[PDB]
Amino acid sequence: QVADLKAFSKHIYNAYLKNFNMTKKKARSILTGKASHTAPFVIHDIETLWQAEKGLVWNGLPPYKEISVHVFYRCQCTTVETVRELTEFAKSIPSFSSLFLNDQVTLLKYGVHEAIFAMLASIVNKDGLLVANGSGFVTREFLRSLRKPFSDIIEPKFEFAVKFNALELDDSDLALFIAAIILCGDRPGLMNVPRVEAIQDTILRALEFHLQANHPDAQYLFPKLLQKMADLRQLVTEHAQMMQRIKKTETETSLHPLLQEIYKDM
Ligand SMILES: Cc1cc(SCc2nnc(-c3ccc(C(F)(F)F)cc3)s2)ccc1OCC(=O)O
Numbered sequence: 729q730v731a732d733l734k735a736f737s738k739h740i741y742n743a744y745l746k747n748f749n750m751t752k753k754k755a756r757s758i759l760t761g762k763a764s765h766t767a768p769f770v771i772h773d774i775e776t777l778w779q780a781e782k783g784l785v786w787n788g789l790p791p792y793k794e795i796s797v798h799v800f801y802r803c804q805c806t807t808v809e810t811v812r813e814l815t816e817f818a819k820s821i822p823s824f825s826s827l828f829l830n831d832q833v834t835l836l837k838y839g840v841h842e843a844i845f846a847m848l849a850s851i852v853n854k855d856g857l858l859v860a861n862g863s864g865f866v867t868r869e870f871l872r873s874l875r876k877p878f879s880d881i882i883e884p885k886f887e888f889a890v891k892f893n894a895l896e897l898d899d900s901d902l903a904l905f906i907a908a909i910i911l912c913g914d915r916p917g918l919m920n921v922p923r924v925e926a927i928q929d930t931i932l933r934a935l936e937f938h939l940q941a942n943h944p945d946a947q948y949l950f951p952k953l954l955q956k957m958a959d960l961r962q963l964v965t966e967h968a969q970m971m972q973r974i975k976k977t978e979t980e981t982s983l984h985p986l987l988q989e990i991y992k993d994m
């Protein structure tokens with residue numbers, strides 16, 4: 729079915745183009761200083777963070793605690809908005825919308841963080857990360873300087889992102905990769921596992937064909953990406969352990985209810 733899969737792919741790419749605020753194409757043009765007549769405002773210390781908050785780049789956040797917790801809250805806000813986009817992306821996939829509504833929630837529940845860290849790589853380079861829909865750039869050094877434990881959260885995502893970005897995927901590749909992360913039969917408590925497994929396999933087959941066409945000189949790209957899916961599960965496991973520790977030890981720190989639900993029983 730060499731051409732049913734091409735149509736399938738184009739539909740998933742269109743769902744992606746329609747629902748994600750930041751594409752990798754856009755992200756990389758910003759990060760190489762070739763997108764606007766003004767660069768992103770660089771946040772690298774307390775003073776620039778404060779300037780960014782005074783309308784320079786940017787509220788409904790919880791009551792201010794301190795700098796490390798403030799950044800933690802902004803990470804939560806960003807995560808909530810990316811979860812919203814991922815849900816619309818998934819719903820824009822017909823095979824997803826026909827599943828048990830409770831299976832839809834199960835797939836999102838166990839898939840969004842894997843997808844988030846995959847997409848994170850698109851707005852990351854070795855020196856920092858885009859924020860505020862590209863209008864700011866927060867430095868990796870600044871994040872390293874936060875108070876423990878908050879300074880340990882993000883550093884592992886940088887390590888993953890730089891290796892992942894070496895594969896030089898584009899948005900059409902990423903649309904299928906994310907779709908495969910969400911439509912995953914290994915997720916606990918699925919009601920119709922064979923139905924999800926068949927969609928997953930269709931997506932992976934589409935992805936394999938897409939890569940042959942899109943990257944014809946890349947050797948072993950498909951099995952490399954499967955390994956990255958495995959790596960993303962470990963990355964999320966470690967992230968969840970750090971979140972657990974923050975919930976245990978940082979009891980002044982507020983936790984968004986949607987995100988607390990996602991982590992409940994993992
Ligand atoms: C704690 C946490 C981290 C991540 S890493 C991806 C990132 N997202 N936003 C980030 C950010 C936004 C703004 C700034 C500022 F500009 F303020 F400095 C700095 C960083 S970094 C993902 C989820 C997380 O916790 C929610 C969860 O686990 O659901």
Ligand SMILES: CCCCCCCO[C@@H]1O[C@H](CO)[C@@H](O)[C@H](O)[C@H]1O
Pocket residue numbers: 804968969971972975983984987988991992993994
């Ligand atoms: C973004 C803030 C979200 C706060 C989440 C911190 C606590 O989550 C807990 O993490 C465990 C997985 O490691 C689950 O097994 C627990 O049921 C759940 O309560």
